[PDB]
Structure 1
Amino acid sequence: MKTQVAIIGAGPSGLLLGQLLHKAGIDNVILERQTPDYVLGRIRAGVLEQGMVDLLREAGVDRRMARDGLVHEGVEIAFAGQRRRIDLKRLSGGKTVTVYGQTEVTRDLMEAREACGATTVYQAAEVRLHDLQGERPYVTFERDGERLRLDCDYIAGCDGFHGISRQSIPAERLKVFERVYPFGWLGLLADTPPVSHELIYANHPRGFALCSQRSATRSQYYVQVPLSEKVEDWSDERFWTELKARLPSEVAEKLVTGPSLEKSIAPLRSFVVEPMQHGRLFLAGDAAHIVPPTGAKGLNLAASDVSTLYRLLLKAYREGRGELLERYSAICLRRIWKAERFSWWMTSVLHRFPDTDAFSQRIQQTELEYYLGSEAGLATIAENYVGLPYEEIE
C-alpha cells in the first residue's frame, strides 16, 4: 500500500486528523488495531472546548453534535456548603463548552469516513514502524492472515497512551515528565436526569465529587477513591450515598439516583513527553501526553495537536514548506503544558490528598475562596476551562 500520511489509530485523534486531511485533499490511511465495534464500544462522556467544536465543524462532522450536544455557558464549583458559578460565557468573551460524548464524536467520525470511502484498516495487528529517519518511511502490519506494508511521507502516531508509535522513538531522544496522583475517579453512568444543567465540581472533607452528564438522557457522576479500591466493593447505593455526602445538601436533596448503567475506577495521572516527534513521526493525543480529567482536557488537547499537525501538513504539502513541521512539538507543547498546569491546579484545589496538614487544608480552602470571589480569579478559570486559544503557525 502507498499513501501520503500514515495514521496509527482510529480513535478521535486519528479519525479527526484523517477526515481533515481527506477534505484538504491529502491522501491518508488509518491503521487501527481493534475492530470498529470494539473502538465504538468504549464509553466515555466529554466536555468539548470551543476549539474542539470548531475543528469538528471544519471537519464536516458537526451535524449530529449540533442536534444532540448541550452548550454550557457556565460551570459550578461547590465547597463549604456553598455553590459558586463561573460564568464561562461572560468571563471569556463568548466561548462556551459543549457536552457531547467522545463515543458519539468517534461514532460520528467513523460514519463520515466510512461514507467518503477514505482508507481504514481494522484489526491491523502487530503494527511496526520503519525508516523514520529517512524520507521514505513505511509501516508493517498483519491483516486477515497476510503481511502488509504501507509506504508514506509522514506517520502520525495517534494510537493513545498504550500505542506503539511513542514506543517507536529511541527512548534516549525523549524526556518524560509525569506525576501519578494518589487517587482515582470512581464513575457511575445513569439514565437518571442530571442534578444540574451545568457541571458541578465539589470539594469536600470526605473527598472530591463530580456532577456531570454524558448526554441529555444520561447522568455522569464521580467520586474520588484511593487507588487500591475495588469497583466491586462499591454497590450503586454505596456510591449514591457517598456522592450525596460530598455535596451541599441543597444539591444532594434534589438528586435522582438510579441503577448504574456503567461503573469503573479511573486512576489520575499527568504525562508529557518532549519532544512529540521523531523524523517523519509525529505524536498526537494520548500517545504523547495524559492530563488528569479534572480539567476536562484529554480529548481537547488531542484536538489541538491534530489542528496544529493538520495545518502544518497543509503548509508542507500545499507549499513545499516541509520545514515548518520541525516546529510541531514546540507549538503543541506550549499549549500542552498550560493545559497540564490548569488541570493540575483544578486537581489540587478539588481533591483530598493523604497526610495533608492543617496548613495545606487552609490554603486549599483559601485558593477556592479567592479565585471564585475575584473577577480576575474567575477569569483565569474561565479562559482556561473553555480552552486557551490555538497558537497560529506563521
Structure 2
Amino acid sequence: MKTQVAIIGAGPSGLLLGQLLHKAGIDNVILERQTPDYVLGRIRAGVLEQGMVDLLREAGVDRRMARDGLVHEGVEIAFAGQRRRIDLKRLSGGKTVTVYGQTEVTRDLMEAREACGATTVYQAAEVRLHDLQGERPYVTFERDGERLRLDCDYIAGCDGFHGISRQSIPAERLKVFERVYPFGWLGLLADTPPVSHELIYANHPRGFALCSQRSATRSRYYVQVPLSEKVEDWSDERFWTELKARLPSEVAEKLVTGPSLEKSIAPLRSFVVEPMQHGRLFLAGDAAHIVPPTGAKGLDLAASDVSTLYRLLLKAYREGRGELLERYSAICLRRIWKAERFSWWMTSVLHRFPDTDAFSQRIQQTELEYYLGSEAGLATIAENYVGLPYEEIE
C-alpha cells in the first residue's frame, strides 16, 4: 500500500496534522492501535489557547467550538485565606483562553476526517517503523491477523508518551530530560454546574485542588493525591469531602456535588527529548514532550509542533523547498522549553511537596504573594498562560 505522509496515532495531534494536510492536497494515512470508542473515553484537557483555536479554524473544523466553547478572561489562584484574580485579557493585551473539552475536540476531527474520506486504520496492531534514514521508509502493521506494508515519503509520530515511534530511534541519537513528581491528580467529571464562572486553582495545606468546567452543566475537579493511591479507594463521597476541605469556605458552601461520570489518577511528569526527529521521522505532540497539566500547556505545544510540521511539509511538497524540514526541532524546542519552565514554576508553587523544610514553604508562599501583587509579576503568569508568540520560519 502507499501514501505521502503516514501518521501513527489518532488523538488531537494525528488528527489535526492529517486534516490540515488533506485540505492542502497532500495525502496521508492515520494508524491507531485502539478503537474510535477507546480514544473518545479519554477526558483529558479543558483549556485551549489562541494558537489551537486558530488552527482548528484553519482546518475548517471550528463550528461546534465557536457555539459551544467558553471564552474565559480571567482565572483565580487561592492561597492562605486570600483569593486573587489574574485578568488575562488586560495583563496580556487582549488574549483570552477557550474552555472546550478534549473529548469534543477529538470528536470534531474524527467526524471531519470521516466526511472527506481520508484513510484511517483503527485497531492497527504492532506498528513497526522501518528504513527511516533511507529515501523510502515504510510502516508494517497488522490488521486482523494480516501483516501489511504501507510505504510513505515521511512519517509523523503523533502517538503519545507510550507510542512506538520515539523508541524507534537509536537511543544514542537521543538526549532525554526528565522529572517525575511525587504526586498525581485525582480527577472527577460530574454533570453538575461548575462552582465559579472561572477556573480556580488552589494551594491548600492539605495539597492542591483545581476547580474546572466543561460547559454550564459539566464540571471537572482535581485534587493532588500521593503516588501510592488507587482510584477504587476514593469513593465519590470521599473525593467531594476532600475537595471541600481544600477550598475557601465560601466556595465550598456554594458547591453543587453529584455522582462521577469519570474518575482517574494521572501521574505528573516533565519530559523532553532532543532531537525531535530522525531521518524521515518527525515526532509531534506528546510523542516528543510531556508537561504537568498545571499550566494547561500540553495542547499548546501539540498545536505549534503540528503547525510547524504542516507549514514545513507544504513548503516541501508545494514548493520543492524540502531542505527546511531539518530546521524542525530547533524551531519547536525554543517553544517547548519556555512552556516547560512555565509548567514546572506553576507546579512547584501550587502543590504540596514531601519533606519540604520551613524555609522552602515560606519561599513558595512569598512567590505567590509577589507574582500576584505586582503588575509585572502578574503579566509574567498571564502572557505565559495565554500562550507566547509563535516563531519565525523564514
Residues 70 and 216 of structure 1 are in contact (CA less than 8 Å); yes or no, is this contact kept in structure 2?
no
Residue in 1 aligned with 2:281? 281
How far apart in 2 are the matches of 1:232 and 1:32? 29
How far apart in 2 are the matches of 1:180 and 1:120? 34
The Cα shift of 1:392 comes to 2.2
Q: Give the RMSD, CA atoms, in angstroms.
A: 1.0
Q: Give SS of 2:186's match.
A: strand
How far apart in 2 are the matches of 1:35 and 1:24? 27
How far apart in 2 are the matches of 1:339 and 1:202? 21
How far apart in 1 are the matches of 2:298 and 2:314? 25
Residues 81 and 249 of structure 1 are in contact (CA less than 8 Å); yes or no, is this contact kept in structure 2?
no
How far apart in 2 are the matches of 1:333 and 1:217? 38
Spell out, residue by residue over 1:270-308, the C-alpha distance to the aligned partner (whole angstroms, 9 max, x if none). Answer: 110000000000000110110000011112211111111
How far apart in 1 are the matches of 2:169 and 2:273? 11
How far apart in 2 are the matches of 1:221 and 1:263? 10
Q: Give SS of 2:270's match.
A: strand
How far apart in 2 are the matches of 1:123 and 1:232? 29
The Cα shift of 1:214 comes to 2.1
How far apart in 2 are the matches of 1:318 and 1:51? 24
More divergent stretch after superposition (307-316 vs 145-154): 145-154
Q: Give SS of 2:369's match.
A: helix
The Cα shift of 1:264 comes to 1.2
The Cα shift of 1:215 comes to 2.4
How far apart in 2 are the matches of 1:187 and 1:302? 22
How far apart in 1 are the matches of 2:142 and 2:245? 52
Q: Give SS of 1:113's match.
A: helix
TM-score (norm 1): 0.98
Spell out, residue by residue over 1:100-139, the C-alpha distance to the aligned partner (whole angstroms, 9 max, x if none). Answer: 1111100100100000001111111111111110111111
Spell out, residue by residue over 1:325-355, the C-alpha distance to the aligned partner (whole angstroms, 9 max, x if none). Answer: 1011111111111111000000010000010
The Cα shift of 1:179 comes to 0.3
Spell out, residue by residue over 1:57-98, the C-alpha distance to the aligned partner (whole angstroms, 9 max, x if none). Answer: 001100111111111111110101111111111111111111
Residue in 2 aligned with 1:220? 220
Residue in 2 aligned with 1:322? 322
Spell out, residue by residue over 1:156-206, the C-alpha distance to the aligned partner (whole angstroms, 9 max, x if none). Answer: 000111110111000110000000000110111111111011111001111
How far apart in 2 are the matches of 1:342 and 1:43? 23
Q: Give SS of 1:323's match.
A: helix
Spell out, residue by residue over 1:26-73, the C-alpha distance to the aligned partner (whole angstroms, 9 max, x if none). Answer: 111111111112212222342001111111000110011111111111
Residues 177 and 271 of structure 1 are in contact (CA less than 8 Å); yes or no, is this contact kept in structure 2?
yes
The Cα shift of 1:261 comes to 1.5
Structure 1 gaps of 5+ residues are none
Structure 2 gaps of 5+ residues are none
Q: Give SS of 1:7's match.
A: strand
TM-score (norm 2): 0.98
> How many residues matched?
394
Residue in 2 aligned with 1:72? 72
Residue in 2 aligned with 1:183? 183
How far apart in 1 are the matches of 2:230 and 2:22? 44
How far apart in 2 are the matches of 1:150 and 1:105? 28
Q: Give SS of 2:6's match.
A: strand
The Cα shift of 1:240 comes to 1.1
How far apart in 1 are the matches of 2:100 and 2:8? 24
Q: Give SS of 1:261's match.
A: strand
The Cα shift of 1:216 comes to 2.5
How far apart in 2 are the matches of 1:180 and 1:69? 32
How far apart in 1 are the matches of 2:310 and 2:15? 12
How far apart in 2 are the matches of 1:74 and 1:115? 37
Residue in 2 aligned with 1:377? 377
The 4+ residue runs of structure 1 with deviation greater than 4 A are none
The Cα shift of 1:145 comes to 2.8
How far apart in 1 are the matches of 2:231 and 2:123? 30
Residue in 1 aligned with 2:23? 23
How far apart in 2 are the matches of 1:259 and 1:31? 36
Spell out, residue by residue over 1:133-157, the C-alpha distance to the aligned partner (whole angstroms, 9 max, x if none). Answer: 0111111111133221111111000
How far apart in 1 are the matches of 2:217 and 2:249? 24
Q: Give SS of 1:240's match.
A: helix
How far apart in 2 are the matches of 1:110 and 1:362? 48
How far apart in 1 are the matches of 2:147 and 2:236? 47
The Cα shift of 1:318 comes to 1.4
How far apart in 1 are the matches of 2:45 and 2:282? 27
Residue in 2 aligned with 1:333? 333
The Cα shift of 1:224 comes to 0.3
